Design a protein around this ligand. Sequence first.
Ligand code: CAC
Ligand code: CAC
Ligand code: CAC
Ligand code: CAC
Ligand code: CAC
Ligand code: CAC
Ligand code: MN
Ligand code: MN
Ligand code: MN
Ligand code: MN
Ligand code: MN
Ligand code: MN
Ligand code: ZN
Ligand code: ZN
Ligand code: ZN
Ligand code: ZN
Ligand code: ZN
Ligand code: ZN
Lengths: 256, 258, 257, 257, 257, 257
Amino acid sequence: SVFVGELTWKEYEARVAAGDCVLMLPVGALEQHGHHMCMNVDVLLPTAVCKRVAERIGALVMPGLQYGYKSQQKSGGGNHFPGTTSLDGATLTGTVQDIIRELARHGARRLVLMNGHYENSMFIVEGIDLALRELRYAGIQDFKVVVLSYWDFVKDPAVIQQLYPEGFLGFDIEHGGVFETSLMLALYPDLVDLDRVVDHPPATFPPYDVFPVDPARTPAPGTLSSAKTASREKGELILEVCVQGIADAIREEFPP
Amino acid sequence: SKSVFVGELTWKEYEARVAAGDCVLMLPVGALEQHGHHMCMNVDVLLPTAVCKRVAERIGALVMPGLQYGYKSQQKSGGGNHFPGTTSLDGATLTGTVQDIIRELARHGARRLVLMNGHYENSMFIVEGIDLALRELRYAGIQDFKVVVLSYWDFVKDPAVIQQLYPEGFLGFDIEHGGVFETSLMLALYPDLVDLDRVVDHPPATFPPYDVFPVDPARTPAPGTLSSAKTASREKGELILEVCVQGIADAIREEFPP
Amino acid sequence: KSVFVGELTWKEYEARVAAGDCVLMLPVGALEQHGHHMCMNVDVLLPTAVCKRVAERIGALVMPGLQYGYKSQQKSGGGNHFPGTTSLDGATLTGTVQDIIRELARHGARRLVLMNGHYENSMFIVEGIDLALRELRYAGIQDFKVVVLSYWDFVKDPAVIQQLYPEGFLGFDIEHGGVFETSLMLALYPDLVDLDRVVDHPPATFPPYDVFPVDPARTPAPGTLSSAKTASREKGELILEVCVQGIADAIREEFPP
Amino acid sequence: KSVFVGELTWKEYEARVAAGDCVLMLPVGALEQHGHHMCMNVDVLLPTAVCKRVAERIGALVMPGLQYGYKSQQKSGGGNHFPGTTSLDGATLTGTVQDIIRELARHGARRLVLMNGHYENSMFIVEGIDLALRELRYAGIQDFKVVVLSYWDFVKDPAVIQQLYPEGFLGFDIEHGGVFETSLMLALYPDLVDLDRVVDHPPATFPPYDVFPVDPARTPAPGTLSSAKTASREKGELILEVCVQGIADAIREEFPP
Amino acid sequence: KSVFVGELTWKEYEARVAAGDCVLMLPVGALEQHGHHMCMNVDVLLPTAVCKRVAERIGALVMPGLQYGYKSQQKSGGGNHFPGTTSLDGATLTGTVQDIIRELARHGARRLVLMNGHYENSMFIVEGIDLALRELRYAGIQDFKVVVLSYWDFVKDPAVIQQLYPEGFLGFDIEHGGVFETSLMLALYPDLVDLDRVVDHPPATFPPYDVFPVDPARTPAPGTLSSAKTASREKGELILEVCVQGIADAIREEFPP
Amino acid sequence: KSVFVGELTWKEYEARVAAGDCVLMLPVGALEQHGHHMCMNVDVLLPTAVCKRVAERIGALVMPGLQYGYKSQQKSGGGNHFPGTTSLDGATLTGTVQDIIRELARHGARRLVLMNGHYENSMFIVEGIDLALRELRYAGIQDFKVVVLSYWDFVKDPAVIQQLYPEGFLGFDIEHGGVFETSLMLALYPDLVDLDRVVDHPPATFPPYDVFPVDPARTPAPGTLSSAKTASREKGELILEVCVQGIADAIREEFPP
Ligand SMILES: C[As](C)(=O)[O-]
Ligand SMILES: C[As](C)(=O)[O-]
Ligand SMILES: C[As](C)(=O)[O-]
Ligand SMILES: C[As](C)(=O)[O-]
Ligand SMILES: C[As](C)(=O)[O-]
Ligand SMILES: C[As](C)(=O)[O-]
Ligand SMILES: [Mn+2]
Ligand SMILES: [Mn+2]
Ligand SMILES: [Mn+2]
Ligand SMILES: [Mn+2]
Ligand SMILES: [Mn+2]
Ligand SMILES: [Mn+2]
Ligand SMILES: [Zn+2]
Ligand SMILES: [Zn+2]
Ligand SMILES: [Zn+2]
Ligand SMILES: [Zn+2]
Ligand SMILES: [Zn+2]
Ligand SMILES: [Zn+2]
């Protein structure tokens, strides 16, 4: 297994003793994903990508962070939905910070943080900075971190044309939409019930945000766009592009 | 999709259950910690989650995603935080995570939570998280949120059971880290993650009535275990499991009446 | 007098708030390197200038701006390894925003517009808003409304973009010390800009990921992510009116008398 | 002059640490209800009394004891719903331990014995130690050693237990305001104990789980988890000498010349 | 049944608070060097003794005094570079005061007098009070009243000052280990003061600013900011009676039955 | 040519810092009510104005000033119950100071002058400095020197005070929106002062203790602690030149090349 949790400490130690061992940490969330999908999607997807990437380039995967930052209206629907269970920014930042400090203690020096929940980004970044600051204080400056959101590797125009034949509107409305639902159909079809999809128009917002979150500004089902056209085929295409692109980046940044 | 695991439900399935009136939520709290040469490191997550799954199925409760990282491993209970693999959180982080989740469950309208600890060292930080959350709920005007905290192993106290588990004599849960107790449960639940042939049959670990910091590696058995899992078995694991599941289910039934 | 709260007496401020529908605006910037051709307080000056004009036009008041913001990121601001750039930890920025909102609530104010001028500040401003609103709820206050925005997001009209980038627009992705900010500065503070020092280098391109610690080799030496060679006062005057008008209308919509 | 740092001049203290092998001891207690028969500062009085005697024997120094500890838990201290009990949040206690260690390290001290007298303090003292040691490591200090213990853990000899509980031993589990602490108080602070006020009730029994908010109905009315009726000055003297000798020996072992 | 909460059983404490108008007092001190002639716990001993006497006269209760305070400052306490002085970070002191106030409110207490004995503590005690009152408000409690004071502020009567300083008064700015505190200690804890060790150096003078890291050369070698050579037990008795009567009256005025 | 860091390019700043001996100055103020006759950003304006003139005379640079300070206290600034006054929690102000010093140390700067213009900021600035210096030590930096001061502390010459208060000097205790600040404002920002609104009430007098929640009845209605009726541009010019020369000399002495 490529999962750190499924190894003995001796097995883990041997791998880190190699000197060039790469570790990967999935950072997700428990967030509503419409009427047609489960709430652990943001954990499941990055974990699935990490698994395949780790198997492809010989890395190990740390247990994923199940809870992420508060859902935002324009990206996740809003934190007023039941089910969505979010952490305060400081909590997520401190979790990332503690994990990095511990990996450094192990002697590990290569980490790939793979985000699956849009809202986590800056808090992951702060956790990285704070940990690196402490490592410098501990006399460690050879620890390198690569952070990314897996969907950012799906930029190729040819690929996008295949996923959105009718036309591409952007990733702005991709919460529980075609993109995530397609991946789930390819990975965990038993957790997707396409017949429950509410085919509503794409959500649109002005160039500003309002707080407290106004429930009237998010589509009733919680999705920001319809997943009606999602398919296992699109999911497999997305999956291959992401696994391929990320494996390549890791090979470039963390050569053996 | 219908499941006891909240993560596998759509928000409507979850909302429907909470709207039911007296929904009980369970939250496994584990750790990523070394467990000798014979077992994997996510044992403290796997075990309380497996117990939660079975209890939930019997009493109709739901299980929240488990906390994968716990408080720093202590020499006398988990071998110590100097071992590789063990990845621990600072107390404030664990406390804050528990606090945040309770704040959110309350917002959802849930009012019944069972926190099932699988990592000894987590206890007091889970407790502080609960107290800080209940304090905020009170400020929010909520005083009917009830929390039950427990470590599944505490439900295995029946002398008859203890005798079956330790026919050679019981020394106590004191040295039960990667020992007979946890290993047997793993053999009954995740045999593939256990390799009894790698077990180091060393004598029970003993310590003086105090602790030393920085942690002294010499005071912990080399394998990381505090006792030998040499006599562990699937059969013992099955007895432990059923005992914990039946006992915990009854506890919830009494504390969270319909 | 002035729309700046700092330039009012406490009685004049009290009278404005007493009106019952007073709107307050808070610029949030940073002290950050902006190439060889511009000064480092750009992110404070610009949102403050926009706030000043929106506030005068719609009758709102402007709070003292936050001079320091979150750590500069490589892909948006060049990186926090640059000298001069002086950044706050996230908790610090979040706490300042949270504290100011708590105080405005105490004054009896209930309408706030947070105008970001530094890309990286966004989520920390958002957390400060959430933590403060959570407290107001505990205090029994649930009628406080906050609008948060980055002024550049109001410059989207295709026609406007065409006039600013007649050669083609490459997204605000590389707009750190580039045509957009420099043009605004040429229209507002020409004395703090010297186009003769602009380094006309091709726009910065990055892979779809980030590396830490920050690698200096991945940021154009000058600190800019794109060249401000084609910047001008006229372009700045256009950007300024589009922003002021747009934000002013957004406020009239969300905060009606 | 005195083993207590608080009663020393800074010169006397300095000279003692200047010796090079000075051992410091920090009592950590609490202000907590202790039934109808004893005062509320017991948790600090006891560890402080034990430290004093140990210090006088091995030549150590005793720091002012922490008067406020972590929240009282139902199964160990009755619960934090009792009046009088005044508890700190975990972070506060941890921060205090952490600050004291930092300061002692600054003094040049490198040997500390933390003696806990309030069960619930345990994990927060441990976290304070770790955070402090982490900082000391960053400061280039890695020769600072800490011994942490709860004085009652040194009373484990079967024979001694026999003289304390000749009627049978149930365990320290129910020892809150019971025979153990009450006996020590009778031998150390007899004027703070009115054994005639003891409410004789069966030992407290709890299911293998905890409930929050704490349910007052699950704690014996008086606040004690067991009866102190059989407590005596004689048992106190026995417990005391056993603890002092055991702890002095531990210190000699962990902090040799 | 004394005035010290720590020496009361929870039932006795509960009865006093149940009375309806119970006043609680909390001494806030420090462990700080006090020259060659006095022990280091002077800052907790003095306010505690004053509280004890005020409480016995007005019927109030005294909580365990805080033994550790904020970092000693050069111009007020000699500086935090001295051995012995063991200080808390500001967040720690603040949180301790906040936690205690929160707990007193839980008990049902609504009247508190915080008596400071360490100058540097003041602003952190103030923040602790504000943060706690903020939470009480969120909890629905708005009748909790707090009086904060440094016992020495009650000694400003010209006739009194003339008695204590017949050679001329220069102010309390240099009263660290000086005539004022030493005289009080001679009247309350003679065994902890060794006047024969006083260093009769001239009053410390400082420029109108401070330097960090603290410069040891700017503090008089002994640690004292003024000579306590003219300190006396008689002067201490005068200061004591003046403070006690003054504080006792203040409490009557602020907390009328 | 400007001495303000915000008005420099990062290249200009880098050159100055790398040149060595570069003294940075950070003004720390507040947004606080200053009576019926003056604006609320006085505490920012004054120290910033002093820094500018001092910097121009000794070759130092001035960082963007902190616009928000700690909570206004009744005896020094009227109280934090006034509208307009917008204050930070202590931790927030302390964290801001701490983050800035950390960053300046990263730039290679090693000399900093913190100029406070809001009385209540003092101790939180001090804690910010201590925490930052602690981290710098962990980073291997032990040559960073900080000077902290309140500009008014340089106005203590009898001849000067006699010239400013030709009717008896009572002290700076009642100096909040009084003759001192109002005079400085008349010499620097006359348009932000309207002496015709000055309320000529007697100086404020308070008992030797504080009360919380703050009691509005104990603060002069206008918010001023003393009357500024006798304020003048001439008195302001004298104060300004005295402070500028004094601070310039202090810096030359503490920060020689
Ligand atoms: C927009 As998303 C993948 O964080 O739900
Ligand atoms: C002592 As254990 C069950 O947390 O490994
Ligand atoms: C990317 As920006 C407008 O904060 O310099
Ligand atoms: C269980 As106890 C000695 O802390 O009251
Ligand atoms: C200046 As003092 C009375 O705290 O020693
Ligand atoms: C007393 As003041 C100059 O901080 O207003
Ligand atoms: Mn998401
Ligand atoms: Mn464990
Ligand atoms: Mn920026
Ligand atoms: Mn206790
Ligand atoms: Mn002092
Ligand atoms: Mn002020
Ligand atoms: Zn998603
Ligand atoms: Zn385990
Ligand atoms: Zn910018
Ligand atoms: Zn006790
Ligand atoms: Zn003193
Ligand atoms: Zn002022």
